Amino acid sequence: DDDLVDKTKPGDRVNVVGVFKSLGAGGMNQLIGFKTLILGNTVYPLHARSTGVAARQMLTDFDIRNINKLSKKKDIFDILSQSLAPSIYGHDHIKKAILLMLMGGVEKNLENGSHLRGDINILMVGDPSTAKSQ
Amino acid sequence: ALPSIQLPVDYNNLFNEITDFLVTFKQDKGPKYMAMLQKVANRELNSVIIDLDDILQYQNEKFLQGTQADDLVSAIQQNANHFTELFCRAIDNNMPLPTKEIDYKDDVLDVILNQRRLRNERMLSDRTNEIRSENLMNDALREVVEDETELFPPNLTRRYFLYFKPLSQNCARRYRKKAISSKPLSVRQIKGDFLGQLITVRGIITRVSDVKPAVEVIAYTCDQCGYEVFQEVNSRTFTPLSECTSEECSQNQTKGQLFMSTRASKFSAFQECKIQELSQQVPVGHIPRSLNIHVNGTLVRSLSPGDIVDVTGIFLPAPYTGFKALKAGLLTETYLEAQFVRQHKKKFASFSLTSDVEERVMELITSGDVYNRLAKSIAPEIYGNLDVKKALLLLLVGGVDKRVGDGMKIRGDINVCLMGDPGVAKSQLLKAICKISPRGVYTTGKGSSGVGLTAAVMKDPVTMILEGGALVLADNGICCIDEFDKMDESDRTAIHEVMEQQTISISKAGINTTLNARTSILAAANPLYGRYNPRLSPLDNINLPAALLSRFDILFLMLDIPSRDDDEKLAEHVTYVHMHNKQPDLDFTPVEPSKMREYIAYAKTKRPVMSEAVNDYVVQAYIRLRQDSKREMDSKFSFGQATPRTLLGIIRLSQALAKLRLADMVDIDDVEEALRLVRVSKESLYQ
Numbered sequence: 001d002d003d004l005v006d007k008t009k010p011g012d013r014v015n016v017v018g019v020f021k022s023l024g025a026g027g028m029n030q031l032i033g034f035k036t037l038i039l040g041n042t043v044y045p046l047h048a049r050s051t052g053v054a055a056r057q058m059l060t061d062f063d064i065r066n067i068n069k070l071s072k073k074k075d076i077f078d079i080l081s082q083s084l085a086p087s088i089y090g091h092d093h094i095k096k097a098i099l100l101m102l103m104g105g106v107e108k109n110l111e112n113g114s115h116l117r118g119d120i121n122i123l124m125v126g127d128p129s130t131a132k133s134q
Numbered sequence: 135a136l137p138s139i140q141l142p143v144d145y146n147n148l149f150n151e152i153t154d155f156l157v158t159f160k161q162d163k164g165p166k167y168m169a170m171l172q173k174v175a176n177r178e179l180n181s182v183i184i185d186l187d188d189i190l191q192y193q194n195e196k197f198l199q200g201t202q203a204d205d206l207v208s209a210i211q212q213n214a215n216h217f218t219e220l221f222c223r224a225i226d227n228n229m230p231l232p233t234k235e236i237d238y239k240d241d242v243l244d245v246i247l248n249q250r251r252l253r254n255e256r257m258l259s260d261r262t263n264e265i266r267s268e269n270l271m272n273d274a275l276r277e278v279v280e281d282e283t284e285l286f287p288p289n290l291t292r293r294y295f296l297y298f299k300p301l302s303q304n305c306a307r308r309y310r311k312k313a314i315s316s317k318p319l320s321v322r323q324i325k326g327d328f329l330g331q332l333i334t335v336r337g338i339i340t341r342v343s344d345v346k347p348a349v350e351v352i353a354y355t356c357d358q359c360g361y362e363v364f365q366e367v368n369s370r371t372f373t374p375l376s377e378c379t380s381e382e383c384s385q386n387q388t389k390g391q392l393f394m395s396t397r398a399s400k401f402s403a404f405q406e407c408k409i410q411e412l413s414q415q416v417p418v419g420h421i422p423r424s425l426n427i428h429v430n431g432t433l434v435r436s437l438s439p440g441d442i443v444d445v446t447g448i449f450l451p452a453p454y455t456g457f458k459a460l461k462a463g464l465l466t467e468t469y470l471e472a473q474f475v476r477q478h479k480k481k482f483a484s485f486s487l488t489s490d491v492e493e494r495v496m497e498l499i500t501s502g503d504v505y506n507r508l509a510k511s512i513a514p515e516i517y518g519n520l521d522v523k524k525a526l527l528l529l530l531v532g533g534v535d536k537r538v539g540d541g542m543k544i545r546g547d548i549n550v551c552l553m554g555d556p557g558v559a560k561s562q563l564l565k566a567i568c569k570i571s572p573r574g575v576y577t578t579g580k581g582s583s584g585v586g587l588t589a590a591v592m593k594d595p596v597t598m599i600l601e602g603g604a605l606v607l608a609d610n611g612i613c614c615i616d617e618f619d620k621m622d623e624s625d626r627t628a629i630h631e632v633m634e635q636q637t638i639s640i641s642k643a644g645i646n647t648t649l650n651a652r653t654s655i656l657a658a659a660n661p662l663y664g665r666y667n668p669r670l671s672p673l674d675n676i677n678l679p680a681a682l683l684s685r686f687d688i689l690f691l692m693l694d695i696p697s698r699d700d701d702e703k704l705a706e707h708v709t710y711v712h713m714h715n716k717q718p719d720l721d722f723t724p725v726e727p728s729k730m731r732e733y734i735a736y737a738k739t740k741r742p743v744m745s746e747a748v749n750d751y752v753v754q755a756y757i758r759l760r761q762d763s764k765r766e767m768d769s770k771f772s773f774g775q776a777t778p779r780t781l782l783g784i785i786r787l788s789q790a791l792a793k794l795r796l797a798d799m800v801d802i803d804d805v806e807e808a809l810r811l812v813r814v815s816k817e818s819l820y821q
């Protein structure tokens with residue numbers, strides 16, 4: 001319908017809530033009619049494992065007050081570094097960059113020039129069974 | 135049944151006030167558009183251009199001097215389709231008609247409308263004679279003649295056309311009014327509520343069709359009653375009509391039998407194309423759509439494919455639905471009608487005005503040290519490589535040619551290759567060159583195959599043509615090419631076929647064409663594994679044969695020697711990039727590209743001619759080159775052979791070097807600059 005045109009690209013996972021309605025004269029005029037559809041609808045895109053947006057997570061004032069209480073410290077980079085190895089021993093300086101890639105850096109596109117790339121790309125190498133697939 | 139609605143929009147006094155504005159305008163000798171209409175009456179022009187600003191200037195003018203004007207900007211802005219002919223019939227009220235005796239060679243269209251003007255009046259002169267001869271102030275006597283005679287309609291004999299023009303924000307900046315028609319809007323921003331409005335879109339011209347005439351009205355000769363029947367068609371298809379529809383063939387036993395005619399019908403120029411989205415305001419996970427735009431009349435043959443253009447027009451549906459079973463009952467398929475073209479990146483070889491041009495060009499000329507200022511200005515966002523930028527400035531020139539006549543041409547094209555890896559950031563310049571330069575297509579290695587960048591054959595839509603590729607597109611322009619080392623080997627063969635000019639041979643399944651291409655080539659390949667081994671030779675760290683290197687007149691090398699003193703300026707260079715958004719400081723001001731290309735395009739129309747003293751200087755200088763090149767004959771740091779094509783380039787170069795003097799003054803210092811860029815381009819591998 002009107003305010004609901006084009007909320008989805010083809011290839012996502014979306015919940016649809018509406019009414020299952022069958023219209024049309026089912027072949028009794030003059031081999032099967034009664035084709036069906038669903039109208040009166042609301043559209044809700046939902047997060048996949050590997051597709052689409054997951055940024056619908058809310059933030060309360062109770063939430064951000066904890067963040068503002070958190071950011072007033074001096075060593076939280078260490079705690080966030082040690083946090084991301086829940087079941088993996090070691091690899092301290094590796095985890096530090098994994099914070100920073102999700103930060104993504106800053107982007108400043110030049111005036112009538114070109115963009116300057118801001119993100120960070122990392123390859124690792126090591127012997128097998130050493131938390132590479134972990 | 136079928137009620138009625140009143141609305142504040144009037145048709146009566148708007149027609150009255152639009153007559154006055156069409157007459158009373160003096161600001162921009164006598165009246166503006168009547169002198170234009172006299173120029174239309176001079177029978178030498180086909181278009182009528184109407185702004186919105188002089189309207190708004192008049193609408194400012196009437197309120198400040200008189201009581202009240204009806205609003206007319208937002209009046210046209212709403213519906214905009216009824217304002218075509220209701221405005222244009224007021225034009226035919228006032229006309230300096232006999233303003234020039236007709237030329238015998240003027241127009242075959244002109245001799246027909248002169249008849250229908252005269253045949254109207256001679257038929258008008260007959261009926262007023264009979265009525266006064268049968269009597270029982272003369273305005274009613276005139277009025278009886280008005281309704282008792284079939285005539286030609288005034289819509290049938292027009293000969294001119296009218297295009298509207300949107301208002302800029304500039305006068306709207308002074309007085310804010312309904313400036314909603316002129317915003318850079320997207321196809322995604324086209325909601326289905328903007329139908330009938332006047333809009334402004336932009337994008338990329340893609341899949342341009344061909345121009346073919348569109349039939350509008352058809353004449354029909356009676357051959358018995360001697361009338362002419364006229365049928366107006368606004369549908370997609372139509373039908374021929376019956377045996378006759380006269381008033382005199384009517385009420386009679388034997389009706390006629392008709393047939394149409396060609397020379398008496400009215401046609402129209404017709405061609406359409408599609409516009410792809412600008413690919414900058416697209417959301418983060420979307421694919422760009424397209425849109426159909428019909429073009430009619432004068433504005434045809436003005437839109438090359440693959441450009442950046444501002445299209446303004448009015449938004450109308452077309453009666454069409456998709457599949458038969460999928461029809462929900464009222465499905466409206468839309469389009470846009472073109473009204474005005476404003477192109478970004480104004481194309482060269484299309485201007486002749488010089489006065490307001492040299493209002494800024496002479497200030498560039500009188501700035502002093504212009505030639506060194508230019509290569510500083512093209513893509514200044516890297517550090518160093520000034521001589522490298524200087525040769526690319528000369529690549530932007532090109533622009534020389536000669537045919538001996540009943541013979542061969544010579545191509546005035548420059549083909550500079552780039553070698554080196556990787557921290558020089560060559561692709562920063564590769565995107566920059568095809569960006570400023572008009573007709574610039576950025577290409578990669580594998581993303582076009584051997585059939586991609588050349589033409590292809592597909593089934594034509596509504597209007598079996600040869601659909602071309604990027605090099606077919608980027609003719610009379612510069613192609614930016616990445617990773618020539620990883621092309622197909624058949625794709626290499628086409629590139630050798632461009633080094634002889636205009637040649638693209640095809641021997642496929644049904645195609646034998648040899649199409650033409652005025653293209654220009656920039657290439658940049660990377661060296662071998664490792665980086666700069668002096669134990670390795672030239673052509674040892676190169677993955678291409680030297681016959682291809684013989685086709686390259688100019689070659690560079692991108693060294694990277696880590697030197698202690700070169701870093702600190704470059705470190706201050708790159709850190710200043712993120713401190714601001716502009717590099718130079720207190721010593722230089724950059725040239726904006728729009729003013730830059732106009733000085734280029736004016737320099738493209740010079741054609742300097744050589745002299746005899748410069749003939750003497752080059753010959754023995756080529757004996758300098760021919761002698762010392764053929765004393766090594768080795769696979770050492772020096773390259774093997776010296777072609778006569780080297781002399782073919784350097785004569786062409788100093789010819790192109792003379793073009794930036796704009797003076798036809800081929801001199802000794804003209805050639806003195808040309809020899810310096812040869813010896814430094816080669817053999818920079820010494821450090």
Ligand SMILES: Nc1ncnc2c1ncn2[C@@H]1O[C@H](COP(=O)(O)OP(=O)(O)O)[C@@H](O)[C@H]1O
Binds near residue numbers: 087089127128130131
């Ligand atoms: N430092 C470590 N701490 C805990 N577990 C580890 C550690 N190193 C390796 N592992 C174990 O290694 C396994 C993952 O093997 P991995 O090295 O990721 O695969 P591959 O080398 O084939 O990519 C996990 O099951 C994990 O239990």
